[PDB]
Write a protein that binds this ligand. Structure first.
Ligand SMILES: [Mg+2]
Ligand SMILES: [Mg+2]
Ligand SMILES: [Mg+2]
Lengths: 144, 189, 51, 145, 57, 75, 143, 68, 64
RNA sequence: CCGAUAACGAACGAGACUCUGGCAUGCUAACUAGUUACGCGACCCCCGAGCGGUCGGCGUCCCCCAACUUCUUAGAGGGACAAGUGGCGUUCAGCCACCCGAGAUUGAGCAAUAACAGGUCUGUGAUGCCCUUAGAUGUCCGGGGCUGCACGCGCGCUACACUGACUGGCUCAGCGUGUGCCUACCCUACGCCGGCAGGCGCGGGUAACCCGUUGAACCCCAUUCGUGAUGGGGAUCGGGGAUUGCAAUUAUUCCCCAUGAACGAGGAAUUCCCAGUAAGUGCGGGUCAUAAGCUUGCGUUGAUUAAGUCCCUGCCCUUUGUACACACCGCC
């Protein structure tokens, strides 16, 4: 009832946008940068923010306390860094403190829906080359 | 139950033709809340088949330079267009979407280079993947040029384009284009 | 032609034309090709590739 | 109130020697008068204390004549000194704002000022060439042929 | 040029080297220029090992 | 397709027409109702929010670009 | 259930504060508000008459989120895209005088004070007023 | 595509099969560990490329004769 | 009198054709009667087993 | 590469290699990076939430006065090899599909034998010969020009609009630069004045210490506009005000107010491109006393089509012919 030292800190990144989720024993609440998930910046993609709790159920999130700190990337990249780090934090929390029999039966739901929830996207960028505007496009050439 | 856009359950929609059954991705396995993901569906051949069809439409709609990266903007356009079609007809926005895709896909085409020395326009039959590609492209272009120089918005023109292709009444741009492709195919079978 | 034929079983005929070529028209029309020094000595007709 | 047209509506309304369509908003209608852009139209209406949400035909004659005397008299109505076309005039040194064909004949006057003293811009204007030093090597072909 | 370049190739191989290569380019006794290349032994050209395996002047 | 010269303000024959037949078909948007009544379109939005405040129509989306209304349900 | 500004919608909170400052007619408003542009990169004056109240609302909220900001930091936040006509677009700051008049008006309102270093932070009274308005605007948004 | 082994990796793989046959087995990771000390390979990439082809070869020779 | 629109399943991809690879010949079987299997040249990305629509039955496809 | 095989064994190039990206809750650590926990605070709270919520508020190497490296930095190591499975294949080389996996094709750098009378003598105290050398083709100083316009062409920037413009609010980066041998020129926080471009004091930074949590744009959300050369577009031109420079006219740049031209998606043709790619979108470096529509990089949003062919255009190889061998720009 008053036991300390039960906390995990699992990050999740996408396109140079890192989000670190700090999960702790407590009443069920999730906050990102000290703000509720529902009050998120790109409100049109807010369903992506709150879908991991939709599939997993609010009962599983009822015994946790998540606070996320984010920096880097853009709006979309920070959104994916949020949903990835949230889904990672409690599944690693379950692995640390409860049996992994429960971890496996929530992990298979996460991977069957969206594997990016628990596996980072490796693609970052590509360097620009000295003959065109970008990485692969080349400057227009003329013959006459 | 998947609640696409928070509503519009995907368990009631069906695909009538087996040719396009395993190329549209509305079923519960490919059912997602939003048509927005980093799915890497163009990584290799035959991966876009399991990409959700609503995500395919919201990807093929950002076109013509000024709007090519604005996926959040295209998703909100799909939001309003889906609201309009549901309001106008009363059926599932996915059911009319699948209905328009099937009727807009040209079932036959012509290779146009069947005789390279002098063009022959040899007839040819299309693949199911080419069907969904051409149908989505035709519908997106019809919605694009319908609301180019008039008061009506993109979401509304996409809405009437979808319903017109869903029935087929010679006023959908995709329907006219498909009928033209079939017509020239019949001319040079 | 077979569908429109009034006969229940008709065999379409064959054109039997024997063609005579000078070596310049034969080469230009790709009937015969240049060959190696050793290849020129082989007089067997080229395979039909019938299967 | 989005109701039928008020009976005191003028679809064509005369200000100075130019007509301004009453259908459009006041701020973007009076801009048809020479010498007033959007920034000058908005400040004079803001000082005239008129609701911008209505159209030009909605204005009554007293409001119209009030925005008239506002624009020809900016200095006396506390309009800032940097909103004027003719700040620090070259013939009398009086800071003024010009709103009519007086702008056309004053631009005409400045044109012949350089022209009579044969300054470089006067010669360039007379020859019909660019005056701000931009290259004429490849641009401006439309205005000559 | 042949006498000098062959003399230095013999000296380099005598002192011990996997390979060497001298190129003399320019004009001698005439207007038209020419290049002579004197090689022997192993010689690599590409990649990082060139940096710490090849001495150039 | 030459010009449209849409009405900038309602008249007797159009203001009564929207009050009598606009809230009768399902799709109610400023763009559709503007091309239907030949009105400009700022008229469409302003009068359409007046119909909202009256209570003759229902609001579904309310987006800054595409705002959608509907007829009230009959039953 | 206490309410902080980070728990509510920022746009509705800002317009709620501007209404609060409008009814409390004590905030000093410079005489040239009706004429000037909010930034160099702007083409038209703001549509709203009470843009000064709205900007003061945004400024107070921004200082609460990150204190220690000055006038130069303010113009970066209210900076934006400058179209530059036919040349390609760039980025431009905001009006420094507008930022100063807002920050000094907040100073006279006793909700903004100088820091131990440069810049201005909120007073505890201004923090109190921010959270009280945040609570009442959470009630309005909910019901 | 593009997984063809160079003659460098192929010949090195054959040679260590010739001399060290009992020391090696069917497991890739064990084969790459014995490759560390039965031969010196300055590249880790070459090390497990050689070891990969060794397991491929030894799998083939477990049921027949090859050019080794 | 008109032959009805029917469907045929891909059995095996024969290979590209059409002097540019824009179309691939492929053998198909008809689900209505599986004994009939003919060759048709198709355009677009084609795998094995996927079913395609046919507006005609008799015409086998030759090269190009 | 494998196989046929008068060849066997090799070498260069390819590959390998170096750098870079992608995973390591494994290792070594960090007051010039932090994170949790705790102590004071500031506010909302009180319905009471109380190990309640927020705080880029202050602190716990103010060295006796917490621990740790997940996030950040950078070293050493690991890790992926067609490794496993199924199918095809001479059942060889290898190819396809799938599983597990961060990754089952991350981008560059380097890059052979040789050729192109390819470009550079205007990069050089690289350089032969020729020219000039006191009324100089040396060198300095002043002014002008390199910008000059009936026209043609190339690289581009901005647009033709409502998938938009304007107004306001919200809101997220990463490369990377920064005060000088000569050398005169730095990045700028904070406060004060003006509407602006700007000016004046007070500092900090030779730098993970300061700018700077680089509060970037696009985007997102609200307002107005309403298919109209219109609130699209901002060319042209007038007046005024600043900044740098000894010097601003032939406008250096920037700012304010005025005018508002073509442009309603573009013929024949033609360019670039396969995944964080194209494209939209801004930001640094170089150029710089003043300077980006250029270039070089970086980040943000982020696609359609394709996993093929020799049809067009080229290139390579083999055979073949040759009176060419300075090699078809030949010979004759
Ligand atoms: Mg290499
Ligand atoms: Mg102007
Ligand atoms: Mg002969």
């Amino acid at each position: 009832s008053k036991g300390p030292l039960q906390s995990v800190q699992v990050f999740g990144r996408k396109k140079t946008a890192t989000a670190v989720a700090h999960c702790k024993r407590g009443n069920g609440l999730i906050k990102v940068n000290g703000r509720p998930l529902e009050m998120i910046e790109p409100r049109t993609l807010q369903y992506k923010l709150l879908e991991p709790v939709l599939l997993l159920g609010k009962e599983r999130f009822a015994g946790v306390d998540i606070r996320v700190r984010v920096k880097g990337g853009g709006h979309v990249a920070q959104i994916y860094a949020i949903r990835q780090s949230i889904s990672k934090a409690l599944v690693a929390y379950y692995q640390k403190y409860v049996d992994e029999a429960s971890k496996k039966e929530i992990k298979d739901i996460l991977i069957q829906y969206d594997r990016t929830l628990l596996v980072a996207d490796p693609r970052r960028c590509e360097s620009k080359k000295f003959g065109g505007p970008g990485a692969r496009a080349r400057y227009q050439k003329s013959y006459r | 139950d998947i609640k696409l856009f928070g509503k519009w359950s995907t368990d009631d929609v069906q695909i009538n033709d087996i040719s396009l059954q395993d190329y549209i991705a509305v079923k519960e396995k490919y059912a997602k809340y939003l048509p927005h993901s980093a799915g890497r569906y163009a990584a290799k051949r035959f991966r876009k088949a399991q990409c959700p069809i609503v995500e395919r439409l919201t990807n093929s709609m950002m076109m013509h330079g000024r709007n090519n990266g604005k996926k959040l903007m295209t998703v909100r356009i799909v939001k309003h267009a889906f609201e309009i079609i549901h309001l106008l007809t009363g059926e599932n926005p996915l059911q009319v979407l699948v209905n328009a895709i099937i009727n807009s896909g040209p079932r036959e085409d012509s290779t146009r280079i069947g005789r390279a020395g002098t063009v022959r326009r040899q007839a040819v039959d299309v693949s199911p993947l080419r069907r969904v590609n051409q149908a989505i492209w035709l519908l997106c272009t019809g919605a694009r040029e319908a609301a180019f120089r008039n008061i009506k918005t993109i979401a509304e023109c996409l809405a009437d384009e979808l319903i017109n292709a869903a029935k087929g009444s010679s006023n959908s741009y995709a329907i006219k284009k498909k009928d033209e492709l079939e017509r020239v195919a019949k001319s040079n079978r | 032609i077979s569908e429109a034929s009034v006969f229940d079983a008709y065999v379409l005929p064959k054109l039997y034309v024997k063609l005579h070529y000078c070596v310049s028209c034969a080469i230009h029309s790709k009937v015969v090709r240049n060959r190696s020094r050793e290849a020129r000595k082989d007089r067997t007709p080229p395979p039909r590739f019938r299967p | 109130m989005s109701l039928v047209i008020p009976e005191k509506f003028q679809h064509i309304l005369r200000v100075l020697n130019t007509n301004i369509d009453g259908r459009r908003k006041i701020a973007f209608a009076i801009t048809a008068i020479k010498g007033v852009g959007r920034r000058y139209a908005h400040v004079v209406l803001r000082k005239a204390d008129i609701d911008l949400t209505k159209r030009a035909g909605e204005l009554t004659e007293d409001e119209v004549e009030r925005v008239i005397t506002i624009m020809q008299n900016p200095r006396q109505y506390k309009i800032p000194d940097w909103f004027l076309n003719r700040q620090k005039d070259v013939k009398d040194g009086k800071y003024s704002q010009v709103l009519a064909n007086g702008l056309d004949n004053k631009l005409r006057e400045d044109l012949e000022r350089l022209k009579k003293i044969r300054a470089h811009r006067g010669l360039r204007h007379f020859w019909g060439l660019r005056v701000r030093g931009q290259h004429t090597k490849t641009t401006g072909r439309r205005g000559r042929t | 040029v042949r006498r000098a370049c062959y003399g230095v190739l013999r000296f380099i191989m005598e002192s011990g080297a996997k390979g060497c290569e001298v190129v003399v380019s320019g004009k001698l006794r005439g207007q038209r220029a020419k290049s002579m290349k004197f090689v022997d032994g192993l010689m690599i050209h590409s990649g990082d090992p060139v940096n710490y395996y090849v001495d150039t002047a | 397709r030459d010009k449209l010269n849409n009405l900038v303000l309602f008249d007797k024959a159009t203001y009564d027409k929207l009050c009598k037949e606009v809230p009768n078909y399902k799709l109610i948007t400023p763009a559709v109702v503007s091309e239907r009544l030949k009105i400009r379109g700022s008229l469409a939005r302003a009068a359409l929010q007046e119909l909202l405040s009256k209570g003759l129509i229902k609001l579904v989306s309310k987006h800054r670009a595409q705002v959608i209304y509907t007829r009230n349900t009959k039953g | 259930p206490g309410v902080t500004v980070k728990d509510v919608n920022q746009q509705e909170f800002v317009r709620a504060l501007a209404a609060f400052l409008k009814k409390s007619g004590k905030l000093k408003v410079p005489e040239w508000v009706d004429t000037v542009k909010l930034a160099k990169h702007k083409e038209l004056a703001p549509y709203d008459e009470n843009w000064f109240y709205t900007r003061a609302a945004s400024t107070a909220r921004h200082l609460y989120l990150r204190g220690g900001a000055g006038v130069g930091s303010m113009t970066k936040i209210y900076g934006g895209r400058q179209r530059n006509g036919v040349m390609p677009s760039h980025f431009s700051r905001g009006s420094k005088s507008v930022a100063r008049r807002v920050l000094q008006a907040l100073e006279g309102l006793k909700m903004v004070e100088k820091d131990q270093d440069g810049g201005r932070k909120l007073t505890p009274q201004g923090q109190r007023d921010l959270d009280r308005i945040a609570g009442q605007v959470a009630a309005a948004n909910k019901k | 595509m593009g997984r063809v082994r160079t003659k460098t990796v192929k010949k090195a793989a054959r040679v260590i099969i010739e001399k060290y046959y009992t020391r090696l087995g069917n497991d890739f990771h064990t084969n790459k560990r014995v490759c560390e000390e039965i031969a010196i390979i300055p590249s880790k990439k070459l090390r497990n490329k050689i070891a990969g082809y060794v397991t491929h070869l030894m799998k083939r020779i477990q049921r027949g004769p090859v050019r080794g | 009198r008109v032959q009805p629109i029917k469907l045929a399943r891909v059995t095996k991809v024969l290979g590209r054709t059409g002097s540019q690879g824009q179309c691939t010949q492929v053998r198909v079987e008809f689900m209505d009667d599986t004994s009939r299997s003919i060759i048709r040249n198709v355009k677009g990305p084609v795998r094995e087993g996927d079913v395609l629509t046919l507006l005609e039955s008799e015409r086998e496809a030759r090269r190009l």
